[PDB]
Every structure is written in C-alpha cells, then in structure tokens.
Design a protein around this ligand. Sequence first.
Ligand code: PLX
Lengths: 57, 70
Amino acid sequence: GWVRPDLGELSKVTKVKTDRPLPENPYHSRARPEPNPEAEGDLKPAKHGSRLFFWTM
Amino acid sequence: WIARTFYDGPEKNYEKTMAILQIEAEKAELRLKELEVRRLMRARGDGPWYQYPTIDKALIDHSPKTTPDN
Ligand SMILES: CCCCCCCCCCCCCCCCC[C@@H](O)O[C@H](CO[C@H](O)CCCCCCCCCCCCCCC)COP(=O)(O)OCC[N+](C)(C)C
C-alpha cells in the first residue's frame, strides 16, 4: 500500500517531535567580555575653552 | 587729578590678577589631567577614545549551512 511521493514533497521542511533536550551551548563558547562603560550625560561647554596655548576661547 | 582721571585703585588690578591666576591654574591642572587621561585610555582602551573598529557581528549568517558541523 505504498504511494510514491509527488514532486516537491521530499524537499519540504518538516517538524520533528523529539524528547532530546535542546543543547544550551552547542558552540562551547566562553563568556563574552564585558562591554565598554557606555557613559552618558548632558553636554556642557569645555572648561575655559580649548585651553590650547594662548587662546582664551 | 592724574590718579582720578586716568587710573583706578589697587583693588581692581589686585582682584583681576586673582581671577586671572585662578583661571590659568585651572587650565594648567586641566591640561595635566587631560594628558594623563589620554595615556590611560590609549594604554587600556577601555575609554571612549582610541576605539579601533572590530568586525560587526550582524554580518554573521546564523542558518543551517548544508553541513551539520558548520
Ligand atoms: C599741569 C597740568 C597738566 C599736567 C600734564 C598732563 C598731560 C597728560 C598728557 C599725557 C597723557 C598720557 C596718557 C593718559 C591717558 C591714558 C589712556 C586712557 O586711560 O586715558 C583716557 C583719557 O584719555 C583722553 O581722553 C585722551 C588723551 C589724549 C591726549 C592728547 C594730547 C595731545 C593732543 C594735541 C592736539 C593739538 C590740537 C591739534 C593741533 C594741530 C581715560 O582712561 P580710562 O580708560 O577712563 O581709565 C580708566 C580709569 N578711570 C575710569 C578712572 C579713568
């Protein structure tokens, strides 16, 4: 009683009912390094200007 | 008469010198601090400055790759 699969059926993406657990770390990665501080604030004018040599602004 | 019509009292120049000295000393200490901060950031790279680009991770394709083992 076997019916031959039609064109376009064996190439389908199907779902699998499995009871095997999903690997939590399949890549065996290390812990990612901590990011840079990402400072935030509200801008204020540069103190006493550019402070480059004799320039007062 | 000359002092009244051409010049001012010692207080003005005295306190102007006080203010000028205060500004210049602050600028000097700011310059020294800025140099030290630059040295530290260039040495460790943990600051906002001297940040050199690395590969963007949004370019990685996370999909099956015709082979189970990547
Ligand atoms: C015996 C009695 C007289 C004694 C001799 C006195 C003669 C004085 C002449 C020399 C003056 C030296 C300079 C003095 C002025 C300095 C610049 C400025 O400070 O003076 C301003 C005043 O200057 C005058 O307005 C201009 C003086 C110009 C003198 C020119 C004399 C020669 C002119 C000749 C012309 C002849 C006619 C043309 C013939 C062809 C006012 O200053 P000010 O910024 O407030 O100061 C702040 C402090 N305050 C507020 C208390 C004053």
